[PDB]
Structure 1
């Protein structure tokens, strides 16, 4: 009977009105079955035509063993309710989580289902289960309880979460716990063995207060290695004209980021019109430029800090051999974080799956470091991604994304 926490949209902001993407017959049936039981438990209820709002709904298999889950793209509602979960109720972000050696993630979204939602706000939680070939109008539900995927749900459950976590935070004062959406990030410096046992302690402390947590045992994420990776120049015994050409061009690109790089001595080495395959020995004066530009290329950039008022931007580029690379930034050439994602050797691997897994890997790291997700510039056809991104999505959140139609001129510069 907990009094509903009233939610008000920003003045001048109407509710979300997003279309429902067409789905497989298999996925529609799983949603109808899930929603039928959710309606039976009072979590959701059907609505009439006087509700014009809609939020897209999808189906994933997190456990992947006869386990269909419902995922709602509350991205638009999150933007139009930002003042509620970013100003009125705000979950502060710890900066010590990135310093901890191991950070385990736990799903705690089931706690929101007990808390009711304000009757006046339930209109904006509306979603539609689509019908195949428009044979019938969709099935229209709205949430009566706190909806998972909405950023206002953990902000409302914030006080209840802090109260439940208080005994565990007391016995373990050095463990950092952060709540982003439906997931609890738990960071410590302990040995992996006793870290997992301490995580199992928190899992049982959460359980004895009525908070269910998936017990499928999402490996631990170690953020000590996280850094802006250094740009590496090729290392060869003997050099050719072409290898020095690729070297001069790469350092000219780094001049936009790293100033103080000089290639003129290397440019003097390649002067007369010569064959690319012609092996030109390295002069000592230009060799000094290679060593001077290897040293300055391992120092971090200057004047690169995170801006809380600006959004994060993540660019992924495909390097081949089942490997991808990424750069998180806010202003161009000022990289807050770079890295590379390489899928473990797998015959089942596909380009979309690797990009999907990369986006989830990048978003999680970005959540741990900054407490908010970036907007991805995805190297994929728009309609291709919008069709198959749900097939490998194992996360409860969905980051913003757009699609790049302009190719990268040189892939090797990032790698």
Structure 2
């Protein structure tokens, strides 16, 4: 874990919530005929509400969510993941997605992305960017679009809240993030010709020919990511392994 110490700012664990400082706040273009839609918030049980509350509060403290009055409104859903009885906020942005202008999907499919890994580079590092979408600011003009209602019995919010960052459930988030990070890591690729860097939204794979080149490469990548404002999961990081898990594949001896 000497890496955790050498790169404080790069790990989600010690660098705090990220923010892509080099990326201009995103403006989300609407379809030519779109008009705001305000969907009714169906009553939520106290159990769900209590489970969600801490997440909402944390996001408010972090500034990711802010109060607002908007012509738009979509449902907030209480979702117990892994069948487990733990609730987390899930916004139904389907009506918003329908009204936002489409963009060409530029994220490669994992199968094709992996085809770009030579047998020569067998030293790997896998990094997962934490709260990736949240690292990208949303332009003030586009924020109203993702509003939802938030109710709390004692001293909280009085109406709607919305995101100041690219949100979950928005049809174009994966693509916009992949493109933004590609722009931010363009220079790194240029400064490290001998390194292979695969990008799949927030799932990164760095490939080197030698253990040391992977150590040096990994150090530089972590340094760059931290400086750019992104955060990698230290808990999940797979640093300089000749065998790693990436996008559902088990990379070993140049296999898969």
- Give the structure-2-normalised TM-score: 0.56
Give unmatched runs, 5+ long, in structure 2: 1-20, 238-243
CA gap 1:52/1:5 in 2 versus in 1, 3 angstroms: closer
CA distance in 2, matches of 1:193, 1:23: 54
Q: Secondary structure at the match of 1:35?
A: helix
CA distance in 2, matches of 1:191, 1:56: 48
* 1:166 counterpart residue number: 186
**Do residues 215 (structure 1) and 250 (structure 2) align?**
no
Tell me by how many angstroms 1:106 deviates.
1.2
How big is each residue's C-alpha offset from its partner over 1:199-218, in whole Å with a ceiling of 9 and x where there is no partner? 56533431233222222248
Conserved in 2, the CA contact under 8 Å of 1:111 and 1:211? no
The one of 115, 137, 156 equivalent to 1:115 is 137
- Give the structure-1-normalised TM-score: 0.38
CA distance in 1, matches of 2:245, 2:43: 34
How big is each residue's C-alpha offset from its partner over 1:107-161, in whole Å with a ceiling of 9 and x where there is no partner? 2434644624242x323212234679xxxx9953112333244344465556652
Aligned-residue CA RMSD (Å) = 4.7
Aligned length: 210
Aligned residue runs from structure 1 range 2-401, under 5 A:
4-14=25-35, 17=39, 22=44, 25=47, 27-48=48-69, 51-58=71-78, 70-81=89-100, 83=102, 86-87=103-104, 91-93=106-108, 95-98=112-115, 100=117, 104=126, 106-110=128-132, 112-113=134-135, 115-119=137-141, 121-129=142-150, 140-153=160-173, 155-156=175-176, 160-170=180-190, 171=192, 173-180=194-201, 183-186=202-205, 188=207, 202-217=221-236, 220-221=245-246, 222=249
CA gap 1:107/1:168 in 2 versus in 1, 3 angstroms: same
Give unmatched runs, 5+ long, in structure 1: 227-415
Conserved in 2, the CA contact under 8 Å of 1:55 and 1:125? no
CA distance in 2, matches of 1:220, 1:198: 19
How big is each residue's C-alpha offset from its partner over 1:289-348, in whole Å with a ceiling of 9 and x where there is no partner? xxxxxxxxxxxxxxxxxxxxxxxxxxxxxxxxxxxxxxxxxxxxxxxxxxxxxxxxxxxx
Q: Secondary structure at the match of 2:224?
A: helix
Runs of 4 or more, structure 1, over 6 Å off, are 189-197, 223-226
Conserved in 1, the CA contact under 8 Å of 2:44 and 2:78? no
- Which is higher, the Rg of structure 1 or of structure 2? 1
CA distance in 2, matches of 1:179, 1:76: 27
